[PDB]
C-alpha cells in the first residue's frame, strides 16, 4: 500500500488535534 | 520467508522525479517541527484524581526504530549476502515488521507493568486509550522516518532527531526561564538570564558577578564559553584532510584528488565507547542493586548519591569537574589511558568491518581505473596502507581526547552530544555544498 | 502451495515467538528463576572466556 | 610507545590545513544551522509549557 | 467523444460536401479544404482499381519510370541537337509527369527523379542565360537530393557568381564543400575564382 | 508549578529576551560605460522605465518589529524602575505572569494557540510551496516556458521565432483590463500598414489568425518595438519598452529550450533574435542601425538602391573617404557633427578576431581517444578601423546588458550540435593578446574528423567568426 | 459497558476520518489531473470519419470514401506520433535542468498514453476493414505524408521565381 506525504502530515495534525480535543473535553466534562 | 507480509505493511510511494533542494529543505523543516510538537504534548489518562519525555507521547519514541536498526545491522554483520533489489525489499519489510511489533510490545508492557496509571485503580476501559495513543505515535514516527529516508529528505530521521534534541538541551540550559528558590532570593537557571538578574538587582555588583561566573550549582557563563570554544575548535579541526594526487588511466589527462580526513570514521569510536560504558554501567548498577552482599560485586561497582564510586565503574565514571579530577590523580590517569586506548582500538577495528580498509580502497581504485600519479610506477596499495591506518588510529585518539577534555572542562552537556551535533551539521553542509547551493 | 502454507506457518510461529519473548518481563514467575540461572551461567562462561583470552595474550606477550 | 606520537606528528605536519576564508564560511554555515534548530526547539518548548499546564489542569 | 460535422453525399459523384454550417469561418474553410483533399484521395483510389485497397509500397510499377526515362532521353537528344526552347518545355513536361506519382508509393524514387530533372532543366536554363530561373531550379534540385549532387551545387554557385551577391555564392560553396573527387575539385576551383 | 507574579521576574525575562532578539535586528534598518553623445527620442520614458526596473525598500519588513521591540523594552524597564522600590527548602517556578494560568484567559489562550497552529502554519507553508514552484531557473513562469516549448518547429529562423516567442505569460499580467482594447486597433493598423513587405512576408496571416486580444496586442507591440515604429500616443510607449525586456527574457528562455532540443538552425536563429531584441532592429534588416544617428532613410542610400545583401559595419568603415560625399551632404541625411559622433562611437565596438584555435590535451602531446581534451582559442579584440568589458551600446531598452559571448562548435554532416556552448563575460587584459579555454571529452574512435566552431556574439549583430578545425586521434 | 466502547468509538472516528480524507484527496487529485488541457489541437480527421460512419448508419455512402478517410486519419496519426517521438528525448533531457515544470511532463505522458490507445484502436479498425490490412496502412501513411510534404516544399520553393525574375530585370 502506498500513500501521499501530505496525507500523512494531515493525519498527524488531526491526531494532535484529537489529543488536545480529548484533553479539553475531559476538562469541560470535569467542571460539570 | 516474509513474502506474505510484504503487501500488508503500508508505505509512502517513492519520489517520481528528482526532488529539488528547496522542496527537500521544506520537507525536512516541516517534519522536524511535527516531531517537536509530538514530543511536547501531554498524554491522556495521566489524570486519575490523584513533563520531559514522561507523558509526552514519546515514551517509546525513537527507541524501537534504533533498536531494530542496531539488531539488524548486527545480524547482517553476523550473516542477505547478494545485493539484488529483492534482498533490499525483504530487509526493509522485515525492518518495518519488527519495528511495529517491538513498538506495540513496548507500549503494552509500559502501560501494563506500571510507571503510569494502574490497571486496578484506573479501570479496564481507559488504559486502551493510552495503548492506542502510544501505538499511533509509534506508527507515525516509523512512517515519517521512511518519508525522510525514501528521498524526500536530506538525511536520516534518527540523526536529525538526535541533533535537534542535543541543540534543544543546549539552548534550554542557556536561556532557561525557570527559577529555583534554594534560599537567599530566587535565581534563574538560564545563564544569561541570571547574569543579567544578579547584575541588576543586587547592590554588590562585584561579588554578584564573581558568584554568577563560578556558580557551580546551576549552569553558569564560564562553562558556556568553554562549550563555545570547544565547538569552534572542533569545527576548525574537522576540515583537515590529506589531498593525495591521482590521475585516471582510462580517460587520460583528467586529474583529481582523493581526500582522507583526520576524522576518519567520524564519531564512530566515541559512539561505540559511549554505548559500551552505558551498558557496563547499567549492568553494574543492576547487579549492585540486588546482590550488593558480595565481594567481587562490591569491587565492580558501588553506587551512592546515584553516582558510582569505589569500583571498576568508578574508574569508568568520567570526572565531574576540574576539582573532582585533581582530587584523584591516578583516577584521571587511568581514565585518560583507557579512553585513548579504547577509542584508538575501536577506530582500528571498525575500519575493517566498515569496508574502508586499505585493501578494499585499493581494489575499488583499481576497478574504477584511478591510478597513483607517482614518480615512476608507484603502487597505490603501498602508500594507501602506509597512510590510512595511521590516520585512523590517530583520529580515534584525537576525538577521544577532545571528548574527554570537553567532559573534564565541564562543557554544556556531555561531549558526545556536542560532537554528534557538530559532525551531523557538518555532513549536512557537505552534502548541501556537493549539491547545487 | 503446501510449501507456501508451511512457510506461512513457520513465519507465524516466528512472530508469535518473538512477541512472546519481548513480553518476558511479564513472566508468570514459573520459569523466571531458571532463565536467571541460565543467564548467570552464560555470563560466567563469557567471563571465563575473557579471562582465558587475557591469559593467552599475557603469555604471548612474554 | 613513542613511535606512535612521532607518526602522528608527521601525519599532522604533512596534512594540509584550512585557510581563514573557508573556515569562516563553514563556521558561519554550521552556526546558522545550529542556532536555527535550537531556536525552533526552544520556542516550541516555551510556547507549549503554559498550554501544557492549562490542558493538564 | 467525436465532434459532429453534418455532411451530405453527392449522388453520381461520391464527393462529400460540408452541409450548411462549423458555425465558424476558420473551421468552415479548414473542413472545406479537408473534404476537398478527401474527395481527391477518393478519386485517386477509385481510379486505382476495383479493389479500393492501396497496394503495398514494396513493388514499383516500372511503366511510369520507363516513360520518364524515355521522355528524358528524347529531351536530352533534342537539347544536344541545339534547340533549348522545346528542350526545357519537355523538361517541364517530364517534371510534371514525375510529380504525378501518387503518394502511397515510395518517395526515394520520385525524389531522385525530380532531382535529376531539375538539375537538367537548370543546366538548360543556364545555357539559355536564364540566370534566376536556372538558379531556382538548381536550388530545387539540390533540395531534392543534397548528397552526391555535386553538379547541382556547382550550377547553383555558378548562377550566383554570375548574377551577383558574392556572399550568397560564398555561403553556397561553403556548404557544398562541407557536404562535398572531380566535383570537389571543381567546387574548389569555382571558389578560388570568387 | 507556581507562576511567580509578586517578585516580578517575568519583566526581567521578557526584557532580556526582547533585547537579545531586537539588538541585531536594528542593523536590518541601518563595470565602465561606453562614451556616447546621443539621446534617442522619448528619453524620459525609457529612463523612467530603467529607474522603475530596480527598486527595493527592505524597511517595512522589520520596522514594525524593531519599534515594537523597543517599545516592549521601554515598558519593561519602566516596570523595573517602578517596582524595584518594592522588590533548612527546594521549589521551582516559572517567570511568567499569573494571568495566563488564571481560569479567565485559559480558554482564550488555548483557542488562540489552536487557531494559530491550525491556520497560520499550513496556509503559509502552502503559499511558500506554490511560490517556490511558480518560477524556474531561467527566471520565467513555468507556464510560459511550457507553452513556448510546444510551438517549437524543426527549422525556424528569424521571422517565426518572434511569433513563437510572443506567446509568453508575463503579458497576461502586464496587459490586464482594458489595456488591450485601448491600443490593439491602432497598433495593429500601424504595424500592418507602415512596414514593408520585406520585413513581414507571411506573418501577417499568423497575426490575424490569433483571437486572444492579449496575445495579439502583445505581438503587435513587439513588432512595433523591433522596428522603432514610434506609434503616436504618450501611453503605449512605456508598454512597448517593457514588452521589449519581457521579450528579451523570453528569448533567453527560448535559447535554453532550443539548445535543449539539439539543432543548428534554431540556435543560430535564437542568438540572432536576441541580438536584434537587445539592439532594437528588425530581424533581417541591414545591421547598420547599430550606430546612433542612422535612420532607414540613410541606410537605403549608403548601401546602394537595393540589394539582397547588407553592408556590415566592417565593410562600411573600411571604405575610403567617399562615404562623406554619399551620406554627409545632408539633403535629408545626417550633418557633420552627427556623422562625426557616429564614427566616434563606431570606433569603440568589440570585434573578436581569432588567430589560433588548436586542440591540446593536458599531460602529453598527441591526444588519445576518450580523453579530456581542451581547446584553446586566443584572439585579440580590435574595434573596426579578470577585466570587465564595456557595457553594450543598447540605446533602446531600459536595462543595460553586459555583452556576453557564446562559443561552441558543431558539424555539418549530420547537421546537429556536438558540444554545448561555454559562455563568458570577461577577458584577461589595438590591445594585447587575450586567451580563452574550454574542455570536453573527445569521442572514442581512431579516425580523425573535422569540426566547425562559431564565435557567435549576442548584444551585437554582424560579428560572427566561423572557422573550421580538424580534430585528430592517433593512439 | 460504555467505558470500552468509548475508546472503540475513538478508533472508529479516527479511522473514518482517515478514510474520508484519503478519499477526498484522491478525488481532488484525480480531478486536478483530469483538468489538464489536451496536448495537441483537436484531431480533425477522426471527427470526419465518425460523422461519415454516423451518416452511413443513418441511411448509403460507398465504403471507398471510408477507406480514404481512414487512410488520411492514419497519416495524421503517424505525423503526430513522429512529432511526439521527436519531442520525447528533448523533453526528458530538459526536465533535469529545471526549465520545464512537472505539469508539462504529466500532459506529455497522458498524451503518449492516449496516442498509443488511439493508434491501437485505428489499426484494429483497419484490420477489421480489409483482410490482413493491419501493418501496411502505416507504410502507406508514412509514404503519403513524406511525398505530400516534399511536394509542398517543392511547390513553395518554385513559387518564388517571379520575384527573382523581376529583381533581375530591375537590376539589369
Amino acid at each position: 500500500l502506498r500513500v501521499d506525504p501530505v496525507v500523512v502530515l494531515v493525519l498527524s495534525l488531526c491526531f494532535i488535534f484529537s489529543v488536545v480535543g480529548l484533553h479539553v473535553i475531559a476538562k469541560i466534562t470535569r467542571k460539570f | 520467508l516474509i513474502k506474505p507480509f510484504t503487501p500488508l505493511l503500508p508505505e509512502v510511494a517513492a519520489p517520481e522525479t528528482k526532488v529539488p533542494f528547496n522542496q527537500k529543505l521544506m520537507w525536512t523543516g516541516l517534519t522536524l517541527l511535527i516531531f517537536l510538537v509530538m514530543s511536547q504534548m501531554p498524554l491522556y489518562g495521566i489524570v486519575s484524581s490523584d513533563a520531559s519525555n514522561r507523558g509526552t507521547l514519546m515514551e517509546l519514541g525513537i527507541t524501537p526504530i534504533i533498536s531494530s536498526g542496531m539488531v539488524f545491522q548486527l545480524l547482517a554483520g553476523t550473516h542477505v549476502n547478494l545485493d539484488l533489489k529483492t534482498d533490499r525489499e525483504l530487509y526493509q519489510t522485515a525492518q518495518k515488521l519488527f519495528a511495529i511489533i517491538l513498538s506495540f510490545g513496548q507500549a503494552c508492557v509500559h502501560v501494563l507493568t506500571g510507571l503510569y496509571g494502574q490497571p486496578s485503580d484506573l479501570g479496564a476501559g481507559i488504559c486502551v486509550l493510552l495503548i492506542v495513543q502510544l501505538v499511533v505515535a509509534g506508527l507515525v514516527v516509523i512512517l515519517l522516518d521512511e518519508l525522510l529516508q525514501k528521498g524526500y529528505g536530506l538525511g536520516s530521521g534518527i540523526s536529525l532527531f538526535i541533533a535537534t534534541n542535543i541543540c534543544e538541551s543546549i539552548v534550554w540550559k542557556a536561556f532557561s526561564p525557570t527559577t529555583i528558590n534554594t534560599g537567599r532570593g530566587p535565581e534563574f537557571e538560564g545563564a544569561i538570564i541570571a547574569l543579567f538578574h544578579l547584575l541588576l538587582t543586587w547592590p554588590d555588583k562585584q561579588r554578584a558577578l564573581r558568584e554568577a561566573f563560578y556558580r557551580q550549582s546551576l549552569p553558569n557563563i564560564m562553562n558556556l564559553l568553554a562549550t563555545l570554544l570547544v565547538f569552534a575548535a572542533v569545527i576548525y579541526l574537522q576540515g583537515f584532510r590529506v589531498e593525495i594526487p591521482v590521475k585516471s588511466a582510462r580517460q587520460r589527462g583528467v586529474r583529481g584528488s582523493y581526500p582522507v580526513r583526520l576524522f576518519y570514521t567520524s564519531n564512530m569510536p566515541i559512539m561505540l565507547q559511549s554505548a559500551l560504558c552505558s551498558n557496563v554501567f547499567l549492568i553494574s548498577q543492576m547487579l549492585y542493586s540486588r546482590f550488593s552482599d558480595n565481594l567481587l560485586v562490591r569491587l565492580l561497582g558501588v553506587w551512592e548519591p546515584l553516582h558510582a564510586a569505589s569500583g571498576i565503574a568508578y574508574y569508568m565514571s568520567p570526572p565531574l569537574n576540574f576539582k573532582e579530577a585533581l582530587l584523584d590523580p591516578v583516577h584521571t590517569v587511568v581514565y585518560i589511558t583507557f579512553m585513548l586506548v579504547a577509542c584508538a582500538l575501536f577506530s582500528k577495528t571498525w575500519i575493517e568491518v566498515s569496508g574502508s580498509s586499505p585493501r578494499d580502497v585499493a581494489k575499488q581504485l583499481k576497478d574504477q581505473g584511478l591510478v597513483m600519479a607517482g614518480h615512476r610506477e608507484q603502487s597505490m596499495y603501498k602508500e594507501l596502507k602506509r597512510v590510512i591506518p595511521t590516520a585512523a588510529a590517530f583520529g580515534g585518539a584525537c576525538i577521544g581526547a577532545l571528548s574527554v577534555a570537553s567532559d573534564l572542562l565541564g562543557a554544556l552537556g556531555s561531549g558526545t552530544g556536542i560532537l554528534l551535533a557538530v559532525t551531523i551539521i557538518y555532513g549536512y553542509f557537505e552534502m548541501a555544498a556537493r549539491e547545487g547551493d | 502451495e503446501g510449501p507456501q502454507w508451511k512457510q506461512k506457518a513457520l513465519a507465524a510461529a516466528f512472530v508469535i515467538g518473538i512477541f512472546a519473548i519481548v513480553l518476558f518481563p511479564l513472566w508468570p514467575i514459573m520459569l523466571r528463576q531458571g532463565v536467571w540461572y541460565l543467564s548467570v551461567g552464560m555470563l560466567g562462561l563469557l567471563g571465563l572466556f575473557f579471562a582465558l583470552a587475557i591469559v593467552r595474550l599475557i603469555l604471548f606477550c612474554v | 610507545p613513542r613511535d606512535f606520537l612521532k607518526d602522528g606528528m608527521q601525519f599532522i605536519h604533512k596534512c594540509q590545513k584550512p585557510d581563514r576564508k573557508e573556515f569562516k564560511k563553514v563556521c558561519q554555515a554550521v552556526a546558522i544551522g545550529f542556532v536555527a534548530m535550537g531556536a525552533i526547539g526552544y520556542i516550541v518548548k516555551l510556547v507549549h509549557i503554559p498550554i501544557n499546564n492549562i490542558l493538564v489542569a | 467523444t467525436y465532434t459532429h460535422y453534418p455532411l451530405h453525399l453527392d449522388p453520381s459523384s461520391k464527393a462529400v460536401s460540408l452541409a450548411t454550417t462549423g458555425q465558424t469561418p476558420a473551421q468552415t474553410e479548414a473542413v472545406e479544404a479537408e473534404l476537398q483533399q478527401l474527395n481527391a484521395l477518393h478519386r485517386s483510389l477509385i481510379s486505382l482499381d476495383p479493389p479500393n485497397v492501396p497496394p503495398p509500397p514494396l513493388p514499383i510499377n516500372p511503366k511510369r519510370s520507363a516513360q520518364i526515362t524515355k521522355l528524358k532521353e528524347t529531351a536530352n537528344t533534342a537539347y544536344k541537337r541545339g534547340n533549348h526552347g522545346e528542350a526545357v518545355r519537355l523538361y517541364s513536361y517530364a517534371i510534371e509527369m514525375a510529380a504525378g506519382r501518387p503518394g502511397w508509393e515510395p518517395v526515394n524514387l520520385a525524389r531522385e527523379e525530380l532531382s535529376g530533372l531539375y538539375a537538367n532543366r537548370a543546366q538548360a536554363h543556364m545555357a539559355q542565360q536564364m540566370w534566376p530561373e536556372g538558379w531556382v531550379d538548381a536550388k530545387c534540385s539540390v533540395e531534392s537530393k543534397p548528397v552526391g549532387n555535386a553538379k547541382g551545387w556547382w550550377r547553383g554557385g555558378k548562377c550566383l557568381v554570375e548574377m551577383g551577391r558574392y556572399d550568397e555564392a560564398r555561403a553556397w560553396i561553403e556548404q557544398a564543400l562541407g557536404i562535398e573527387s572531380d566535383g570537389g575539385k571543381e567546387l574548389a576551383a569555382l571558389l578560388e575564382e570568387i | 508549578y507556581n507562576y511567580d507574579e509578586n517578585g516580578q521576574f517575568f519583566p526581567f525575562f521578557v526584557l532580556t529576551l526582547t533585547g537579545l532578539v531586537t539588538l541585531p535586528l536594528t542593523y536590518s534598518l541601518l563595470a565602465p560605460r561606453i562614451k556616447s553623445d546621443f539621446k534617442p527620442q522619448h528619453d524620459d520614458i525609457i529612463q523612467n522605465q530603467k529607474r522603475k526596473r530596480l527598486r527595493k525598500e527592505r524597511r517595512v519588513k522589520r520596522a514594525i518589529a524593531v519599534v515594537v521591540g523597543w517599545a516592549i523594552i521601554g515598558y519593561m524597564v519602566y516596570l523595573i524602575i517602578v517596582t524595584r522600590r518594592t522588590a533548612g527548602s527546594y521549589s521551582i517556578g516559572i517567570a511568567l505572569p499569573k494571568l495566563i494560568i488564571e481560569e479567565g484567559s485559559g480558554k482564550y489562550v488555548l483557542m488562540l494557540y489552536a487557531s494559530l497552529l491550525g491556520i497560520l502554519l499550513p496556509y503559509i507553508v502552502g503559499r511558500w510551496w506554490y511560490g517556490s514552484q511558480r518560477y524556474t531557473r531561467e527566471k520565467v513562469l513555468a507556464a510560459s516556458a511550457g507553452n513556448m516549448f510546444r510551438e517549437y518547429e524543426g527549422t525556424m529562423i528569424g521571422g517565426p521565432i518572434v511569433n513563437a516567442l510572443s506567446t509568453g505569460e508575463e503579458y497576461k499580467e502586464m496587459l490586464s483590463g482594458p489595456k488591450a482594447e485601448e491600443g490593439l486597433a491602432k497598433v495593429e493598423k500601424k504595424v500592418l500598414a507602415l512596414d514593408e513587405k520585406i520585413l513581414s512576408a507571411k506573418d501577417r496571416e499568423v497575426l490575424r489568425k490569433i483571437d486572444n486580444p492579449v496575445r495579439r496586442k502583445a505581438l503587435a507591440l513587439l513588432w512595433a518595438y523591433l522596428n522603432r515604429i514610434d506609434l503616436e500616443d504618450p501611453v503605449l510607449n512605456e508598454e512597448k519598452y517593457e514588452a521589449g525586456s519581457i521579450a528579451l527574457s523570453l528569448t533567453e528562455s527560448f535559447t535554453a529550450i532550443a539548445l535543449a532540443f539539439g539543432n543548428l538552425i534554431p540556435i543560430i536563429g535564437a542568438y540572432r533574435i536576441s541580438q536584434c531584441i537587445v539592439q532594437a532592429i528588425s530581424p533581417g534588416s541591414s545591421p547598420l542601425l547599430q550606430l546612433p544617428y542612422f535612420t532607414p532613410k540613410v541606410v537605403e542610400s549608403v548601401e546602394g538602391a537595393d540589394v539582397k545583401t547588407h553592408l556590415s559595419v566592417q565593410k562600411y568603415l573600411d571604405m575610403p573617404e567617399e562615404r562623406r560625399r554619399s551620406l554627409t551632404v545632408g539633403p535629408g541625411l545626417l550633418t557633420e557633427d552627427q556623422y562625426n559622433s557616429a564614427i566616434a562611437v563606431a570606433k569603440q565596438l568589440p570585434l573578436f578576431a581569432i588567430s589560433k584555435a588548436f586542440f591540446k590535451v593536458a599531460g602529453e602531446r598527441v591526444v588519445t581517444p576518450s580523453s579530456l581534451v581542451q581547446l584553446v582559442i586566443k584572439g585579440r579584440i580590435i574595434p573596426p578601423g579578470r577585466v570587465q568589458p564595456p557595457l553594450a551600446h543598447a540605446p533602446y531598452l531600459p536595462r543595460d546588458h553586459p555583452p556576453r559571448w557564446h562559443i561552441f562548435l558543431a558539424d555539418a554532416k549530420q547537421g546537429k550540435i556536438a558540444v554545448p556552448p561555454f559562455t563568458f563575460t570577461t577577458f584577461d587584459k589595438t590591445f594585447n593578446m587575450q586567451t580563452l579555454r574550454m574542455q570536453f571529452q573527445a569521442p572514442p574512435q581512431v579516425g580523425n574528423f573535422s569540426f566547425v566552431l562559431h564565435m557567435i556574439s549576442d548584444s551585437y549583430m554582424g560579428f560572427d567568426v566561423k572557422q573550421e578545425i580538424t580534430l585528430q586521434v592517433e593512439d | 459497558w460504555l467505558t470500552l466502547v468509548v475508546p472503540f468509538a475513538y478508533l472508529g472516528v479516527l479511522i473514518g476520518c482517515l478514510a474520508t480524507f484519503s478519499s477526498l484527496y484522491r478525488r481532488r487529485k484525480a480531478a486536478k489531473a483530469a483538468s489538464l488541457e489536451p496536448w495537441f489541437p483537436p484531431h480533425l480527421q477522426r471527427d470526419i470519419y465518425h460523422s461519415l460512419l454516423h451518416l452511413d448508419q443513418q441511411q448509403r455512402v460507398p465504403e471507398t470514401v471510408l477507406k480514404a478517410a481512414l487512410l488520411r486519419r492514419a497519416a495524421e496519426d503517424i505525423k503526430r506520433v513522429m512529432a511526439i517521438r521527436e519531442q520525447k528525448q528533448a523533453l526528458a533531457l530538459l526536465l533535469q535542468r529545471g526549465s520545464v515544470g512537472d505539469e508539462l511532463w504529466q500532459r506529455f505522458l497522458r498524451a503518449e498514453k492516449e496516442m498509443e490507445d488511439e493508434v491501437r484502436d485505428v489499426v484494429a479498425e483497419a484490420n477489421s476493414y480489409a483482410p490482413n490490412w493491419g501493418q501496411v496502412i502505416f507504410q502507406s501513411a508514412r509514404e503519403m505524408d513524406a511525398n505530400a510534404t516534399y511536394r509542398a516544399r517543392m511547390e513553395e520553393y518554385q513559387a518564388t521565381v517571379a520575384e527573382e525574375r523581376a529583381w533581375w530585370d530591375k537590376k539589369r
Side-chain angles (χ1 to χ4, degrees), chain B residues 100-120 122-175 177-203 205-320 322 325-327 329-340:
Chain B
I100 66 184
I101 290 299
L102 207 169
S103 88
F104 184 83
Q106 203 73 223
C108 187
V109 73
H110 270 70
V111 66
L112 196 53
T113 185
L115 306 179
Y116 303 95
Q118 306 309 306
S120 87
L122 265 291
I126 177 63
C127 70
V128 304
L129 282 169
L130 288 80
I131 305 149
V132 169
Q133 288 174 353
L134 294 175
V135 293
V136 162
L139 197 143
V140 172
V141 166
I142 189 51
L143 201 144
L144 269 70
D145 187 1
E146 184 205 301
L147 172 61
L148 277 187
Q149 182 62 329
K150 215 73 171 184
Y152 298 84
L154 57 87
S156 300
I158 51 180
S159 183
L160 185 66
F161 297 155
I162 295 304
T164 188
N165 177 32
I166 290 299
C167 84
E168 174 56 20
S169 199
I170 292 305
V171 177
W172 178 262
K173 287 282 199 61
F175 296 154
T178 184
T179 179
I180 290 183
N181 194 23
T182 186
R184 299 182 178 181
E187 302 161 342
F188 284 92
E189 179 180 342
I192 298 297
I193 324 291
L195 174 61
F196 203 100
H197 174 266
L198 287 181
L199 168 66
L200 193 48
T201 194
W202 275 33
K205 269 70 176 179
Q206 212 72 13
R207 207 186 315 110
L209 287 176
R210 206 275 174 187
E211 62 197 302
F213 276 167
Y214 300 87
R215 176 155 56 208
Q216 189 178 3
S217 198
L218 300 93
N220 52 330
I221 294 296
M222 194 273 302
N223 74 98
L224 165 66
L225 201 59
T227 298
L228 182 65
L229 196 143
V230 165
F231 168 86
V234 69
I235 280 296
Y236 164 80
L237 192 61
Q238 191 65 237
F240 275 177
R241 53 173 55 184
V242 184
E243 292 185 352
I244 181 170
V246 62
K247 61 101 180 179
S248 300
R250 192 156 315 281
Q251 38 175 6
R252 307 188 181 274
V254 61
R255 303 309 180 95
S257 302
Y258 200 89
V260 289
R261 300 156 308 281
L262 175 58
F263 275 77
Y264 208 67
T265 52
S266 315
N267 58 281
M268 195 58 58
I270 183 60
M271 183 66 176
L272 288 181
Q273 178 271 350
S274 87
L276 178 66
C277 54
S278 158
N279 263 17
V280 72
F281 281 160
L282 178 61
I283 292 301
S284 177
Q285 186 268 355
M286 199 274 300
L287 191 61
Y288 179 81
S289 85
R290 301 295 92 91
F291 294 86
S292 196
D293 47 354
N294 204 334
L295 302 180
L296 75 170
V297 191
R298 182 186 299 102
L299 186 62
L300 173 61
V302 192
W303 305 79
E304 278 179 0
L306 195 143
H307 295 269
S310 56
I312 306 302
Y314 167 65
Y315 288 154
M316 286 291 306
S317 174
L320 302 153
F322 195 77
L326 63 87
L327 263 293
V330 309
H331 168 60
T332 74
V333 173
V334 60
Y335 187 84
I336 289 282
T337 297
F338 167 84
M339 281 299 305
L340 298 192

Side-chain angles (χ1 to χ4, degrees), chain F residues 66-88 90-101 104-106 108-196 198-293:
Chain F
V66 59
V67 62
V68 302
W70 281 97
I72 287 187
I73 289 296
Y75 173 79
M76 294 314 169
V77 69
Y78 160 81
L79 202 153
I80 298 313
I81 298 314
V82 165
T83 307
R84 187 200 169 275
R85 181 178 292 103
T86 61
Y90 187 86
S91 87
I92 52 181
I94 313 297
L96 290 178
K98 200 74 174 185
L99 320 181
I100 296 180
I101 195 53
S105 198
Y108 304 150
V109 68
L110 176 60
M111 203 60 57
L112 186 142
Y113 152 82
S115 158
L116 186 141
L117 177 61
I119 304 304
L120 193 44
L121 194 70
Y123 170 77
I124 202 63
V125 161
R127 210 275 300 275
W128 180 95
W129 195 22
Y130 287 165
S132 158
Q133 297 314 107
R134 168 176 296 180
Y135 267 60
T136 188
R137 177 195 300 268
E138 275 61 31
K139 314 303 296 180
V140 72
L141 307 186
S144 198
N147 181 276
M148 193 164 51
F149 169 86
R150 175 162 56 258
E151 301 288 344
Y152 171 81
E153 208 178 358
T155 178
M156 54 176 180
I157 186 168
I161 302 183
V162 175
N163 293 333
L165 190 85
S166 194
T167 182
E169 270 295 333
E170 287 80 350
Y171 304 96
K172 296 289 181 57
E173 299 170 47
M174 191 265 295
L175 290 175
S176 315
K179 302 178 182 179
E181 305 301 324
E182 178 184 2
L184 177 62
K186 174 60 62 181
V187 60
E188 192 184 52
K189 181 259 175 184
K190 185 72 65 59
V191 167
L192 208 71
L194 185 61
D195 283 7
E196 202 188 28
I198 304 301
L199 298 87
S200 298
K202 64 95 176 179
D203 295 6
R204 299 190 172 101
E205 299 297 329
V206 181
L207 166 61
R208 179 174 52 92
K209 283 299 181 180
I210 58 185
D211 214 318
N212 193 328
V214 174
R215 158 161 175 168
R216 187 151 71 178
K217 179 70 179 303
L219 191 141
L221 216 56
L222 182 51
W223 269 107
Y225 166 57
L226 282 177
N227 296 21
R228 304 179 170 187
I229 209 62
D230 199 331
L231 52 88
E232 178 60 34
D233 55 350
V235 63
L236 276 181
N237 299 19
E238 182 48 60
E239 315 296 337
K240 193 180 60 177
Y241 295 156
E242 181 268 358
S245 316
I246 298 304
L248 196 149
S249 278
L250 290 176
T251 290
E252 188 276 338
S253 189
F254 168 76
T255 291
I257 289 186
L259 176 58
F261 283 103
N263 256 325
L264 208 54
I265 306 300
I267 297 181
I268 206 56
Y271 282 152
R272 290 186 189 277
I273 204 56
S274 165
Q275 304 162 243
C276 297
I277 283 186
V278 76
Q279 191 63 283
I281 61 182
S282 165
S285 180
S286 296
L288 213 57
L289 309 183
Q290 299 155 314
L291 304 197
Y293 275 73

Side-chain angles (χ1 to χ4, degrees), chain G residues 3 7 18 42 53 55 80 90 108 111 135 140-141 150 156 158:
Chain G
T3 175
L18 166 65
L53 270 186
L55 192 147
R80 268 291 296 165
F108 181 85
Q135 51 273 7
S140 300
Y150 170 82
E156 199 276 339
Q158 177 61 223

